[PDB]
Amino acid sequence: CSALLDPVLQAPGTGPAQTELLCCLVKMESLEPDAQVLMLGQILELPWKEETFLVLQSLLERQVEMTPEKFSVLMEKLCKTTSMAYAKLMLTVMTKYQANITETQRLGLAMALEPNTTFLRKSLKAALKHLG
């Protein structure tokens, strides 16, 4: 993970052909929870673009536990938009990790979702209101 994850995603012109393998990696049953945590830590250090959102969403789909500090880092990067992939990521975090979401994080999510170009705006609005 540490050797291949970073340079492929940071390589220019990275496409579906690359991201499909990363999604498959993060989906392995053999990727133990702690190894999933490590992968999460590694992904957080990359610059965030659509490809990062896809892989992060795929990893977050396994309901991996997170310390509040790591969760805070995730939310911080999360809160800083026009794409559907970002929307899906945001929705997943807002729905499966609701128990960890503070008021500041909720508002941060609200601000990052504000524009109407994003897909599924209304569902995001509903999830947000549910967190209140």
Partner: protein, 156 residues
């Protein structure tokens, strides 16, 4: 008090809470033409459709009312179609309803088999099956294509 409920009451459908099947005073085609001509004759003629669907969607923000609204309805006077299907039978309302339905469908990615083992997403897409008339193919086509690209595995 809401535009939606009042138009439905005058037009002749009983909007029940969401626990039992909505009753139907009238024939289905009769209902459709009734609400059609009602909104036709009503002043602020082009805007009442938008107001209507906004009232509708604000009504179906609560789950259970929508759950009953989706199911097949009860004729009092012996087993009929659903109200949503009938309302999409009216061409003017159709694209607005489609819009609403799809926008609010992704709420239900992760809540599968909640209460009565009823898969809301399967039901909602089932609402669109077997339509008499498609007002917009292009909008429906593009919207379902956006939708399909994103969903999780089982639902997609």
């Amino acid at each position: 008090d809401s535009i939606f409920v009042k138009l439905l009451k005058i037009s002749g459908i009983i909007l029940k809470t969401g626990e039992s099947q909505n009753q139907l005073a009238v024939d289905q085609i009769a209902f459709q033409k009734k609400l059609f001509q009602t909104l036709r004759r009503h002043p602020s003629y082009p805007k009442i459709i938008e107001e209507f669907v906004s009232g509708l969607e604000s009504y179906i923000e609560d789950e259970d009312s929508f759950r009953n609204c989706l199911l097949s309805c009860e004729r009092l006077q012996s087993y009929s179609k659903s109200l949503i299907k009938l309302l999409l039978g009216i061409d003017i309302l159709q694209p607005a309803i489609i819009k609403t339905l799809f926008e609010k469908l992704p709420e239900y990615f992760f809540e599968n088999k909640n209460s009565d083992e009823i898969n809301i997403p399967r039901l909602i897409v089932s609402q669109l099956k077997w339509l008499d008339r498609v007002v917009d193919g292009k909008d429906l086509t593009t919207k379902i294509m956006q939708l399909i690209s994103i969903a999780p595995e089982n639902l997609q």
